[PDB]
Design a protein around this ligand. Structure first.
Ligand SMILES: [Ca+2]
Ligand SMILES: [Ca+2]
Ligand SMILES: [Ca+2]
Ligand code: NA
Lengths: 142, 136, 137
């Protein structure tokens, strides 16, 4: 019942690409919201913000079309993880990455096209998705 | 107390039926019996936030799948196949579910992009789990 | 407020695969419990329960086929052919219930020839696992 059992710590989001065109050196703005109940992901910037310190899982899946895709998962101010998928004609591809990262309050995580942004073949339409998900797995205790 | 609801399953026949769930029948985990291998459908028994992740070996034909919730397509994954180039396609998402909601995968559309593949040494899998039970 | 934690997330660096041997991922994204052993490439269950495993491989120069092993048996197979001038991305994930003593790791399939895994300063191939639900009595 209300307030009855162990308290549940939640911080999670799952978002998809719509019409946004990637911009060099900027976070990828995923604006389709599968889940963002804590408002910890900001679709106006593409960044997730940690409000509960702990261990987080992040996972992304990209439909690769027209151009190569190369993305970087950033934490705070640093690229942590890289995923490259080359595109050849008539061969849509699927690229993914996932990792665990420990985060402190205020740390931000986001996805960006790698380098100066050329390998930006991320794709979505009414029946194709490119997604980015993150969630708190273990809150810190002390 | 631990709230558990999870399953992880694999394909053992890769022949699909248009407009029907992909029936993953190999059981990696299904301890709560919340996934029904006779239909290919997960049944929500605990309201909350769920993570779903699938991985498909793409062979012989293009693959296009849709993750369904309550007979609505929620998520799409397309991977074209070129000869002599087996591929790997995957998708994952968080969905909030209420008790009674059902989730499954289907080949997209009229079912023609059905190049999913599994055999004795190749897998295509579908996994889901409760992450946070709902509370007030 | 106690949380049962057992998790790791690791990436390939300069290690070169060898037939019939675990793949030794040495870039540590997380390994706070030391339940993954970088000296051998193996995760060891230290808390009986349900675990999620997920891996992502950059496929370059040669076909990739990997097997996820649990207690010396291959559980799960992921194959991705490499065509010239077409780097690919291969992934797999599964839930496995583990008991004390169970080890989990990745190997190249079969005799080890489909070993096109790739990593460098701006490409990754990763392996992650975590305890989702500890067993209770
Ligand atoms: Ca493809
Ligand atoms: Ca391929
Ligand atoms: Ca490719
Ligand atoms: Na792929």
């Amino acid at each position: 019942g209300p307030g009855s059992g162990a308290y549940v710590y939640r911080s999670a989001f799952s978002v998809g690409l719509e019409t946004y065109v990637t911009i060099p050196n900027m976070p990828i703005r995923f604006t389709k919201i599968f889940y963002n109940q804590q408002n910890h992901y900001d679709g106006s910037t593409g960044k997730f913000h940690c409000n509960i310190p702990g261990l987080y899982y992040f996972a992304y899946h990209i439909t690769v079309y027209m151009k190569d895709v190369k993305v970087s998962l950033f934490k705070k101010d640093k690229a942590m993880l890289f995923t490259y998928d080359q595109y050849q004609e008539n061969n849509v591809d699927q690229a993914s990455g996932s990792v665990l990262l420990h985060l402190e309050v205020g740390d931000q995580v986001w996805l960006q096209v790698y380098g100066e942004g050329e390998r930006n073949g991320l794709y979505a339409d009414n029946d194709n998705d490119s997604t980015f998900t993150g969630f708190l797995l273990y809150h810190d205790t002390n």
